[PDB]
Amino acid sequence: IVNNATNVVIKVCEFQFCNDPFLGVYYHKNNKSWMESEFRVYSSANNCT
């Protein structure tokens, strides 16, 4: 279950998970905006219904 700042996603797949999975939000100084930029959770996704 991940909330990637735009839509709630529920997936049950054979993920090859990273040892340090995370999400990365980048703050842009010039326009003072925060954007979702990094999605480091799974290296692969297969075999799921």
Ligand X SMILES: *[C@@H]1O[C@H](CO)[C@@H](O)[C@H](O)[C@H]1NC(C)=O
Ligand Y SMILES: *[C@@H]1O[C@H](CO)[C@@H](O[C@@H]2O[C@H](CO)[C@@H](O)[C@H](O)[C@H]2NC(C)=O)[C@H](O)[C@H]1NC(C)=O
Is 7 a binding residue for ligand Y by CB under 6 A? The answer is: yes
Which one of the spans 5-13, 16-24, 26-34 is the region binding ligand Y (CB under 6 A)?
Answer: 5-13
Long-range CB contact pairs, 35-42, < 8 A, 24+:
36/4, 36/5, 36/6, 39/4, 41/2, 41/15, 41/17, 42/13, 42/15, 42/16, 42/17, 42/18
Is 38 a binding residue for ligand Y by CB under 6 A? The answer is: no
Is 16 a binding residue for ligand Y by CB under 6 A? The answer is: no
Residues that bind ligand Y (CB under 6 A): 4-7, 9, 36, 46-47
